[PDB]
């Protein structure tokens, strides 16, 4: 996958994901993307649904495909491990869930992105992730568990 991070004062505090046609970036992080082609894009602020602008030209579109409907609750891919929940997100162990790990996509077994993490630092022995997804008909929803600090 291709996921350009976000630089601020030398450290990495967020990640920017690219889906087919559009470029994603979390609102909670501040900084400049390392891709100079992506810096000229006029990203616009929006509501909690995290709408940005895919103003990239034709030569590199459709990097990955967003996952469609008919979601099973089985195995799913993740950068730091695996998640196995559809209605919620899985209770992943420690290590993942620190700081500056926002914007990392959650992929399927065919390489299709299903969700993008935004929060849920630590909730005890079981950590829940606050992600965005599509509920039933492709309409973008935002699911947030209780006590989900911005992560």
């Amino acid at each position: 996958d291709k996921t350009f991070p976000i630089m601020l004062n030398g450290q990495v505090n967020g990640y920017a994901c690219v889906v087919g046609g559009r470029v994603f970036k979390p609102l909670h992080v501040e900084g400049r993307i390392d891709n100079e082609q992506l810096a000229a894009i006029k990203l616009k602020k929006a509501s909690i649904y995290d709408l940005e602008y895919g103003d990239v030209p034709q030569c590199m579109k459709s990097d990955t495909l967003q996952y469609t409907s008919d979601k099973p609750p089985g195995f799913y891919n993740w950068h730091h491990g695996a998640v196995q929940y559809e209605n919620n997100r899985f209770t992943v162990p420690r290590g993942v869930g620190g700081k500056g790990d926002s914007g990392r996509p959650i992929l399927d077994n065919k390489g299709r992105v299903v969700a993008i993490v935004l929060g849920g630092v630590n909730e005890g022995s079981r950590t829940a992730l606050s992600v965005v997804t599509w509920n039933q008909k492709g309409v973008t929803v935002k699911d947030t568990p209780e006590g989900s600090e911005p992560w």
Binding site: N135, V139, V141, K142, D143
Partner: protein, 49 residues
């Protein structure tokens, strides 16, 4: 003058219709958007679950 002058002495029927349309024009447009603001908040609440 034998009579007395009041506040609504000079207001005619055609002039009173204009100030009740212009008042009603603002009240029609305000409640049009105020209903439509809460309509999409109901769909956005129902979109999640």
């Amino acid at each position: 003058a034998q009579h007395t002058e009041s506040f609504t002495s000079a207001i005619s029927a055609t002039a009173w219709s204009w100030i009740k349309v212009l008042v009603g024009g603002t009240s029609a447009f305000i409640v049009l958007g105020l209903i439509a603001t809460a309509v999409v908040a109901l769909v956005l609440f129902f979109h999640r679950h």
